[PDB]
Amino acid sequence: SKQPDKQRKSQRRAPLHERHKQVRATLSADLREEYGVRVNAGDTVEVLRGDFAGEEGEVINVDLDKAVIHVEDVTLEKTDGEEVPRPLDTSNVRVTDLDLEDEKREARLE
Template sequence: MRKTFSKFWVASKQPRKQRKYRYNAPSHIRHSMLSAHLQKGLRKELGRRSMALKKGDEVEIRRGEFRGRRGAVSAVDMKRLKILIEGIKRKKVSGQDIQVPIDPSNVVIVKVNLEDKKRKKIISRKTPETKQ
């Protein structure tokens, strides 16, 4: 089995190959793996179903121990494919508070951070034209 990433890889049912694909993926593909669904109101407004997560986006956790909690994305971990959310913390045995990494598939984007010019351009390119 090759150790490098192949852009021609289509699909496999084998979990080991799925894990290998994710582990060896380059950063431009990893970025798309860090996307989450938009809330229903935002879907209609932006004309798309999901977006890549970015620092500053406000999200709501839908699955897991912290279900129902909201917060802004404080960091996006490209290596581990996880996000860190403000206010989602756990105590270590030493008593120190640490942020809990959350999988992007378990959150829904509630508010999009539109400070980035490139992101605005992407949204304007993807939004459907209104009929007059």
């Protein structure tokens, strides 16, 4: 990690969990100001960019794999028809309703 490429190298060649590193982000008021450690991968979010900028949505599939995630909102319909989930670019994921009814969720980040 001292050159532009070792980034990819460690990032996805080493811990997929590093990809979780990718998971990293932030959220609403409460939680966020509250602090900034430990998360939920699958939590609620709003997209702060793209036409979909400022759009209300929920995180369903934490998809560190393809290096991003899927939220019910950020979705598009096909051409044949059927509607389906959009490839969501980590980059503008704002979490807020901090998924926590899950005791463990609470324990870890709120």
